[PDB]
Each structure stands twice: as structure tokens, then as C-alpha cells.
């Protein structure tokens, strides 16, 4: 079985130096570089990952279409559907108590 | 001879580092506030947990650190200064709190930010209010009684993390982790096991001190080792304390 050399950079096996083995049209087995995985947004209240948005690294994320980075609601990314339902209710119910305390 | 271990470890390059610190711990300065508890966190060198608070100063949001009393939670609203209610975790002027109550983080003079009771499991007791002089007597966890003016502030509860000294450290590595952030030498080599160039207890054909271990308060610094200015020694019973408020 054919064995590999490091084509570029350092041999020292840090997080930035992941590699995989690949077979070429010329029938050689060579190392090729790998980019790191990305984490997408977590909710600002509960720590849950937001639905409807992609996971990518900051530079690659910025080059995608805006639709990959939001949902069409009051808080776009930012917060999940349950947390917005709570926020909408809370603001309403507080105003009604103040209404009563003003009228009485 | 040469300089002893006790002096070398007091030089500046040996002082504790602050790079992992969260900030300076202490009360806000304002006459009244409403605060929210944002997070409860561990800080690398300290066994009692810290609480991050958020309060408005002018229009702007500002952040502070308190030591956590037991029974707060993330999201709780707390009331600071004059006109706060007697509820667990509020901060109040000392003259408002009834006798026999338990308090933490007491200011020694107004607006100092809180000193006194700050270690896990500790509290102070309010023992007397004097309506003429506007003084209050507090009993500290050493047993000492001290007088503070009624305008000083204090936190209502016991400091979190009590009970920690119940579980013995059975192994050498467990002690290692505890002393890694402290200033004391660990492991500690005994002075009688050194040569006379290194320590006043060194040398001789048997391991012994050879001279009395009780030393004067006014002795020169590079030989002030042993029991410094001891009033008595040994395992026998002492005498009655004298007490005034």
C-alpha cells in the first residue's frame, strides 16, 4: 500500500491541520486538506440551536444568500418560536395590569 | 547563610495572578436600584460562586459582581439601597434589619462596597442597635464584636458553598489541586530536615530544633520562624472571654 507525505505546512497534527486520503485520476493516493466544521446560532434565552438556518464558518456564511441566515419573524435568527410567544404575551399582560392600576 | 523560603515567596514575581479574574467584587454606589441577576459563575481561585448583576445608571446598562448567597436563581429581580424590602437576597441599610438576624458582605463604612463576611458558609449576627449614637454591634465569625454606623449596607442571607470541609482529601493529588492557586509552599519541606545555611532549625547529628521555638515580635525578619509572639503553648484549656457590645 502506497504511503503519503505532507505536501504543505507543518506535520504537527493541530486542529488547523486535518487531512484526508484521496485517489486521483492518475492512480495515486495522496493527502488533501480539510476545513474545520461550523456551529450555527443558539437562542439568546434557552441555549437551543435555531431552526431554519445553516451551519458554516464565519467567512463562508457571509457569502451565502440572506435566506440562509434568518427566518421571517419578529426576531430573525436571534430567538426561537417559543421564546417569542412568551415575549409577545408578557408585554401584553403587563400593559393590562398597568391599565387597571391607572383606571382603579 | 542565605535567604529563607519565607522571604523569597513574598517578592513580587510570586504574587497571585489576576488573568482569569471576572472583575472587582462589590456593591453599586447609587442610592436606589433595581437589578437583575444575569448569571451565576465559578471563578478560578475562589470556592464561593459569584453572581453577575445588571442595573441602569443614567440610560445605560451597567454590570457588577456580588458574592452569591444561597437561594438566588438566574433571572431573579433584586432591590438595592434605601426602601428595599426584607426579602432574601436584597441589600438594605443595617439599621432597618431586626436584632438576631444573619447578614453577609457588610460595609465597614458607607459606600466601601462590602467587606467582612465573604467565605463559604459564613455569616454575621446583629447583636445591638443604639438609638442615640446610631451605632450597631455585629458579631463576626471569629467571635469578635465590632461597631458599625447605621448607614452601612449589608446583604440578607448566608454565603453559598457551605459544608466543603467535611470530605477529607485522601490523596496527594487532591491536595495539589487545592493549593495550586494559593501562595503557601506545597509540598512543604520541614526546617529540621534542612542544613544550617538554609533555615534556623537545620543541622546536627539528630533531627532536633535545639533552641526554643517561641520567638519575639521584634525579632529580625530572616530568622522570625516558629511560633511568633505566642502567649501560651500546648493542648490545655484556656480562659473566659470578656464581652461588651
Amino acid at each position: 500500500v502506497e504511503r503519503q507525505v505532507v505536501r504543505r505546512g507543518s506535520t504537527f497534527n493541530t486542529r488547523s491541520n486535518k487531512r484526508k486520503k484521496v485517489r486521483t485520476p492518475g492512480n495515486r493516493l495522496v493527502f488533501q486538506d480539510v476545513k474545520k466544521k461550523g456551529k450555527g446560532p443558539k437562542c439568546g434565552q434557552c441555549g437551543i440551536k435555531l431552526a431554519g438556518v445553516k451551519e458554516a464558518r464565519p467567512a463562508a456564511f457571509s457569502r451565502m444568500r440572506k435566506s440562509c441566515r434568518k427566518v421571517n419573524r419578529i426576531l430573525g435568527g436571534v430567538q426561537c418560536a417559543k421564546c417569542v410567544q412568551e415575549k409577545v404575551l408578557d408585554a401584553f399582560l403587563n400593559a393590562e395590569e398597568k391599565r387597571m392600576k391607572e383606571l382603579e | 547563610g542565605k535567604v529563607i523560603r519565607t522571604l523569597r515567596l513574598q517578592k513580587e514575581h510570586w504574587k497571585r495572578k489576576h488573568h482569569k479574574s471576572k472583575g472587582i467584587v462589590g456593591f453599586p454606589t447609587l442610592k436606589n436600584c433595581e437589578a437583575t441577576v444575569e448569571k451565576i459563575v465559578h471563578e478560578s481561585g475562589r470556592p464561593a460562586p459569584l453572581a453577575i448583576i445588571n442595573y441602569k445608571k443614567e440610560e445605560k446598562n451597567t454590570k457588577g459582581l456580588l458574592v452569591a448567597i444561597e437561594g438566588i436563581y438566574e433571572g431573579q429581580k433584586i432591590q438595592i439601597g434605601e426602601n428595599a424590602s426584607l426579602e432574601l437576597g436584597n441589600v438594605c441599610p443595617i439599621k432597618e434589619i431586626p436584632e438576631g438576624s444573619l447578614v453577609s458582605m457588610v460595609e465597614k463604612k458607607p459606600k466601601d462596597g462590602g467587606k467582612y463576611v465573604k467565605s463559604p458558609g459564613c455569616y454575621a449576627t446583629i447583636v445591638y442597635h443604639n438609638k442615640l449614637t446610631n451605632q450597631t454591634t455585629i458579631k463576626l465569625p471569629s467571635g469578635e464584636r465590632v461597631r458599625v454606623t447605621g448607614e452601612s449596607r449589608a446583604l440578607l442571607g448566608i454565603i453559598a458553598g457551605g459544608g466543603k470541609d467535611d470530605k477529607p482529601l485522601l490523596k496527594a493529588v487532591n491536595a495539589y489541586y487545592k493549593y495550586k492557586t494559593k501562595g503557601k509552599p506545597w509540598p512543604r519541606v520541614r526546617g529540621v530536615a534542612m542544613n544550617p545555611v538554609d533555615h534556623p532549625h537545620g543541622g546536627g547529628n539528630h533531627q532536633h530544633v535545639g533552641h526554643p521555638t517561641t520567638v519575639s515580635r521584634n525579632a529580625p525578619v530572616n530568622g522570625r520562624v516558629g511560633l511568633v509572639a505566642a502567649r501560651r503553648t500546648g493542648r490545655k484549656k484556656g480562659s473566659r472571654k470578656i464581652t461588651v457590645n
Binding site: - | I40, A48, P49, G71, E74, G161, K164, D166
Partner: protein, 87 residues
């Protein structure tokens, strides 16, 4: 469970360290690992994150507590005194 007569959770240590010391450690070690009841949601899902900080695995609330138990003896008493002050 409970395959040993006396040694309990301290069986991990074999014949090392003293007998008397192990039976003090045991009290704390059994207390640390249990799940406890949540005040906010009623479920038995509370566990320790770090000394002094306890946390619920369902609803996410964090609360200050003791080193090896969520509520200490001094707290159970003092909490009552405050409720009387409010009267």
C-alpha cells in the same frame, strides 16, 4: 446494586487510605451523585455543575446551594425566620 456489606461507594479505593477516613468521605460522595427535586417544575432532575451551583436538566434553571447538597441545614432553618419577618 449493593454488592458490598460496608464499603459502599468507597470500594473504588481498595485497601488504601484509612477505614475511618473513607467512612467520612462516603457521606459526601453518596450525596453528590443523587438527583434532587426542582422547585420550579416538580421533576427529580436537579444535579450539581460545580461546588455551590445546582442545575435542572429539564427547565434549565440554576440555583445557589451547598457543596454536597442543594439546601444546607442552616438554610432550612433561616428560610423560616424570614417568612415570619414578613408577617
Amino acid at each position: 446494586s449493593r454488592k458490598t456489606k460496608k464499603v459502599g461507594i468507597t470500594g473504588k479505593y481498595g485497601s488504601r487510605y484509612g477505614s475511618s477516613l473513607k467512612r467520612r468521605a462516603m457521606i459526601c460522595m453518596n450525596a453528590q451523585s443523587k438527583r434532587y427535586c426542582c422547585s420550579f417544575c416538580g421533576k427529580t432532575t436537579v444535579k450539581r455543575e460545580v461546588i455551590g451551583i445546582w442545575s435542572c436538566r429539564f427547565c434549565g434553571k440554576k440555583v445557589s446551594g451547598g457543596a454536597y447538597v442543594p439546601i444546607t441545614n442552616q438554610q432550612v432553618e433561616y428560610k423560616q425566620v424570614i417568612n415570619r419577618m414578613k408577617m
